Amino acid sequence: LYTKTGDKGTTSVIGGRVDKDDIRVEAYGTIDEANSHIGYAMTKLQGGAFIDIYNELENIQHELFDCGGDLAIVEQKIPYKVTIVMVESLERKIDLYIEEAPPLERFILPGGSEAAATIHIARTVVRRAERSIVSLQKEVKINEVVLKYVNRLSDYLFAIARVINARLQVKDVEYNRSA
Amino acid sequence: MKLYTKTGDKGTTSVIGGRVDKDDIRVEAYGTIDEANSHIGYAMTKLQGGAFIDIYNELENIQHELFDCGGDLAIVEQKIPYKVTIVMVESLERKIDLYIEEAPPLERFILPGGSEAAATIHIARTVVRRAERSIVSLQKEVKINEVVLKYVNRLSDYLFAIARVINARLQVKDVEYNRSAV
Amino acid sequence: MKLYTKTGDKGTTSVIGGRVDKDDIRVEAYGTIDEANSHIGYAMTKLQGGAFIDIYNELENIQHELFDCGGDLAIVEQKIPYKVTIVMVESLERKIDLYIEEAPPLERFILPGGSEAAATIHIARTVVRRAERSIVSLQKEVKINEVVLKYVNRLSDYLFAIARVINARLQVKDVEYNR
Ligand SMILES: Nc1ncnc2c1ncn2[C@@H]1O[C@H](COP(=O)(O)OP(=O)(O)OP(=O)(O)O)[C@@H](O)[C@H]1O
Ligand SMILES: Nc1ncnc2c1ncn2[C@@H]1O[C@H](COP(=O)(O)OP(=O)(O)OP(=O)(O)O)[C@@H](O)[C@H]1O
Numbered sequence: 001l002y003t004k005t006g007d008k009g010t011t012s013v014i015g016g017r018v019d020k021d022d023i024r025v026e027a028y029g030t031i032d033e034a035n036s037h038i039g040y041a042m043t044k045l046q047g048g049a050f051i052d053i054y055n056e057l058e059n060i061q062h063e064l065f066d067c068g069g070d071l072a073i074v075e076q077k078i079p080y081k082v083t084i085v086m087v088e089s090l091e092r093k094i095d096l097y098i099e100e101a102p103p104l105e106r107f108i109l110p111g112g113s114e115a116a117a118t119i120h121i122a123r124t125v126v127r128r129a130e131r132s133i134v135s136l137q138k139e140v141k142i143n144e145v146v147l148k149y150v151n152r153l154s155d156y157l158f159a160i161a162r163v164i165n166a167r168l169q170v171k172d173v174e175y176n177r178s179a
Numbered sequence: 180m181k182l183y184t185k186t187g188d189k190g191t192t193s194v195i196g197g198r199v200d201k202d203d204i205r206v207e208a209y210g211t212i213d214e215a216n217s218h219i220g221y222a223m224t225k226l227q228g229g230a231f232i233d234i235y236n237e238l239e240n241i242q243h244e245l246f247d248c249g250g251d252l253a254i255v256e257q258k259i260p261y262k263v264t265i266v267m268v269e270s271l272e273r274k275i276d277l278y279i280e281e282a283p284p285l286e287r288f289i290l291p292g293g294s295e296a297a298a299t300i301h302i303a304r305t306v307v308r309r310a311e312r313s314i315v316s317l318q319k320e321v322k323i324n325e326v327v328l329k330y331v332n333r334l335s336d337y338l339f340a341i342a343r344v345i346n347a348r349l350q351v352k353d354v355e356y357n358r359s360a361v
Numbered sequence: 362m363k364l365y366t367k368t369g370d371k372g373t374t375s376v377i378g379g380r381v382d383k384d385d386i387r388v389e390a391y392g393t394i395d396e397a398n399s400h401i402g403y404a405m406t407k408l409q410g411g412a413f414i415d416i417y418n419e420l421e422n423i424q425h426e427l428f429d430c431g432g433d434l435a436i437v438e439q440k441i442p443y444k445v446t447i448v449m450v451e452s453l454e455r456k457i458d459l460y461i462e463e464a465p466p467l468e469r470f471i472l473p474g475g476s477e478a479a480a481t482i483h484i485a486r487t488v489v490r491r492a493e494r495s496i497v498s499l500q501k502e503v504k505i506n507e508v509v510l511k512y513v514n515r516l517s518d519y520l521f522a523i524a525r526v527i528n529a530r531l532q533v534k535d536v537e538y539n540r
């Protein structure tokens with residue numbers, strides 16, 4: 001598993017090698033970090049009551065993995081994998097879950113059920129990856145669809161976090177000092 | 180009620196009093212505060228027992244103060260009064276002395292972990308400190324509510340303190356760094 | 362006592378051999394090692410089974426070694442002796458060889474997830490790799506104990522290897538990229 005070729009700080013990317021602190025590798029790594037959190041959250045959504053959300057998450061892990069591949073491409077040796085079609089799929093689901101969840105009355109704070117809490121954490125990591133992608137874009141040309149996808153994904157995560165709390169008979173945690 | 184507007188699909192976003200790139204140090208500080216807040220929210224799910232009523236309510240309040248920190252940090256040129264005050268920082272200090280007093284004597288570095296609850300608080304602790312580094316960067320570019328830096332600095336001590344109390348109440352002994360002379 | 366001294370309220374803090382701003386790359390590397398160590402601490406709570414005493418015990422040791430990594434990185438101009446040596450890196454290598462042998466043959470690309478224990482280890486893996494990127498950035502500004510870079514590099518491989526062994530022992534298949 002270990003080749004030791006990266007022991008000095010450089011690593012391999014599609015079409016070349018770069019320093020491990022290259023913004024391209026930071027973006028790629030944070031996408032991986034975000035994908036890991038979704039993997040954890042998924043171990044809490046295996047029940048029948050969450051088949052819909054769980055299957056979508058499995059697919060999202062593949063798409064997130066594809067985002068990584070699209071970003072770690074110094075020399076375009078292959079077309080991009082992430083397409084606008086995948087963003088629209090996220091959009092259709094977000095509309096469905098916003099309809100399912102109760103009306104949003106107050107500002108939401110991350111937390112509630114264990115499952116929703118983990119999804120809330122994954123959401124913040126996805127947002128941190130988005131900032132890295134924005135930085136990357138400032139230096140090199142990127143698959144702009146990846147930025148739209150990661151941007152839309154945190155909204156999807158926000159949507160299901162609320163649906164998850166609702167299904168589990170737990171109210172969302174709200175910003176409310178009158179409570 | 181439609182979450183996505185797509186206005187941020189190109190990398191820019193809104194802040195209080197203007198628009199900036201999503202990788203602006205300001206948005207990063209704000210985002211990391213949110214990240215820290217999410218870890219505290221997860222940790223809380225493990226602290227609803229009757230043995231942690233005091234800590235749970237404090238974390239509940241802290242989620243609000245942390246959210247307020249993000250609001251103060253996302254304010255450009257200050258169109259509204261800041262929300263984070265020294266009073267909230269002092270409240271943190273009084274609790275820390277209380278928890279240090281409750282926990283067994285601390286004489287050396289300890290491994291972060293133990294109980295599931297304390298482990299999560301320890302992670303939240305590191306994310307808060309990460310947020311602190313971003314706030315420090317922010318302050319070098321623009322004027323901020325300096326109280327927010329004090330609060331974030333002090334909050335990680337609070338988290339360190341309750342993590343040890345949680346393990347203690349759960350009878351999980353701290354593991355001291357094996358470099359015994361440190 | 363007073364855990365807080367308030368000397369850091371203005372944005373500066375001390376390292377071994379001086380004081381610097383908290384956003385200095387040295388403090389960031391140090392901080393991210395602490396973050397990675399904390400994630401390992403959480404993962405360990407999921408590996409308390411009698412079937413995981415070996416992995417748990419090795420992770421506990423790694424936590425001490427991560428503290429050594431932290432200390433080494435905080436040393437300004439070799440104010441004091443470095444503690445992380447090549448011996449610890451090779452120790453990781455031997456365990457990796459053993460775990461690759463234990464786990465089933467790796468055929469497809471793995472996505473982070475599976476058993477909750479493995480899922481949490483995968484997350485810790487990404488944080489370790491994030492810590493590595495900061496160390497690489499630090500090394501570009503100052504001379505560091507190069508062995509810490511090798512250790513942190515090899516560490517993520519160790520974590521990846523035990524994640525798979527953990528799923529295997531729990532009789533859970535690894536989540537693989539497959540659509
Ligand atoms: N610290 C890191 N953060 C994010 N991505 C990384 C990091 N290190 C490597 N990668 C990416 O992940 C892939 C595989 O990782 P791996 O650790 O095998 O690379 P390496 O460190 O260069 O090799 P080695 O582990 O043998 O030293 C590489 O193609 C590289 O682009
Ligand atoms: N990636 C990010 N990290 C941290 N904070 C963000 C990020 N994106 C947006 N924000 C902040 O959070 C708030 C709401 O997030 P939201 O995602 O709705 O913004 P946006 O991305 O600009 O809009 P849209 O999602 O419709 O494209 C904004 O006011 C913005 O300042």
Ligand SMILES: Nc1ncnc2c1ncn2[C@@H]1O[C@H](COP(=O)(O)OP(=O)(O)OP(=O)(O)O)[C@@H](O)[C@H]1O
Binds near residue numbers: 369
């Ligand atoms: N935000 C941070 N991220 C990473 N490492 C830090 C951070 N703040 C401090 N450190 C490091 O950890 C050590 C102890 O942390 P501590 O918070 O006690 O320092 P401080 O903030 O300077 O002091 P005080 O908390 O009394 O203001 C210091 O030696 C410092 O190098």
Ligand SMILES: [Mg+2]
Binds near residue numbers: 151152154187
């Ligand atoms: Mg957005």
Ligand SMILES: [Mg+2]
Binds near residue numbers: 332333335369
């Ligand atoms: Mg401090």
Ligand SMILES: [Mg+2]
Binds near residue numbers: 514517518
């Ligand atoms: Mg490596």
